[PDB]
Design a protein around this ligand. Structure first.
Ligand SMILES: CCn1c(C2=C(N)NON2)nc2c(C#CC(C)(C)O)nc(O[C@@H](CCN)c3ccccc3)cc21
Lengths: 316, 10
């Protein structure tokens, strides 16, 4: 069985209300990983057990170049621990914040890898439900790595629906802001918001008052910079179609609609998944313990059983 | 640069 003191704990990469993420070295191999350490007390308090177990279980079987690979899942009497590959490039949120805006070309590159990942998940009857800049990270080479699978629902195929009011406020699709249920198209809306952010340098809707924000999502029309290309405008218009039945990727073909959109005219989708496309930005990390693409806010800081957890990549 | 968003459920 795997335990806490099998690792050296080097730097805090992130901290939130659910828990914290830490750069760790595996003592037994000397290799570096990221560890997410959630407290059971908080999870049981917020009644997020199913979601937290879902996160492990989905990672235990998924394999894809642009999804974060889970090395270990294990636990203590009071903590839940995920050990995954350290994304040296950090979050897209970090980069977009620093650079303000990406070129349509650079956006097209990240978008294509996210579409690849979403096609994979949706083919596996899994809706991710939380596409955002915080959950899109970059590996040392500069490729997309989707992270945090704690709001995934399983058994959702074309037509199937979901009932949990969940996601991130600024990224919630308008149908999620209605009664009853919604479908897997919510993911394509999510892509739409991040694509809009990457090319327009802001969310399509924003207000710190959720009541005001949720009204904007349902009612307000999206605007575009004049300079934005017609195809770029068309993609965002399609991805951010308020009606999910007429949203790009919301039909039965799922990702094939998005893939066949003219914004990705230059993209070969088999080159995408085979990693044959060259990243426009390569993380300038000098060592393995380098945390330059993470915030000083975190890196400056010092440092009853859940079933269906306790997984290992060497064993399964 | 918008502020850090926080995911949620129910
Ligand atoms: C610190 C950034 N980070 C990383 C990093 C890696 N794997 N290498 O570097 N950073 N992995 C994260 C994963 C993951 C994962 C798996 C694959 C195990 O599902 N979930 C994160 O969630 C956020 C919450 C967002 N709703 C969080 C932030 C702080 C504290 C607790 C949660 C953040 C993550």
């Amino acid at each position: 069985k795997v335990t806490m003191n099998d690792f050296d704990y080097l730097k805090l990469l992130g901290k939130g209300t659910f828990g914290k993420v830490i750069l760790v070295r595996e003592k037994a191999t000397g290799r570096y990983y990221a560890m997410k350490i959630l407290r059971k007390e908080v999870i049981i308090a917020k009644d997020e057990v199913a979601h937290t177990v879902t996160e492990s279980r989905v990672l235990q079987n998924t394999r894809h170049p642009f999804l974060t690979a889970l090395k270990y899942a294990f636990q203590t009497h009071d903590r839940l621990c995920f050990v995954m590959e350290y994304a040296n490039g950090g979050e897209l949120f970090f980069h977009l914040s620093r650079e303000r805006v990406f070129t349509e070309e650079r956006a097209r590159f990240y978008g294509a890898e996210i579409v690849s990942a979403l096609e994979y998940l949706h083919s596996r009857d899994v809706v991710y439900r939380d596409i955002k800049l915080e959950n899109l990270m970059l590996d040392k080479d500069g490729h997309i790595k989707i992270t945090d699978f704690g709001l995934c629902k399983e058994g959702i195929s074309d037509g199937a629906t979901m009932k949990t009011f969940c996601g991130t406020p600024e990224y919630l699709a308008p149908e999620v802001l209605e009664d009853n249920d919604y479908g897997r198209a919510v993911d394509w809306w999510g892509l739409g918001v991040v694509m809009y952010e990457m090319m327009c340098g802001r969310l399509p809707f924003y207000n710190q008052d959720h009541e005001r924000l949720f009204e904007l999502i349902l009612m307000e029309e999206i605007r575009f910079p004049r300079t934005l290309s017609p195809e770029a405008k068309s993609l965002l218009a399609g991805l951010l179609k308020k009606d999910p039945k007429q949203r790009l990727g919301g039909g039965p073909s799922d990702a094939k609609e998005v893939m066949e959109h003219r914004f990705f005219l230059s993209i070969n989708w088999q080159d995408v998944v085979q990693k044959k496309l060259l990243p426009p930005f390569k993380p300038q990390v000098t060592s393995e313990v380098d945390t330059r693409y993470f915030d000083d806010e975190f890196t400056a800081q010092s440092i009853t059983h859940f079933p269906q957890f306790d997984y290992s990549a060497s064993i399964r | 640069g918008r502020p850090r968003t926080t995911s949620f459920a129910e």
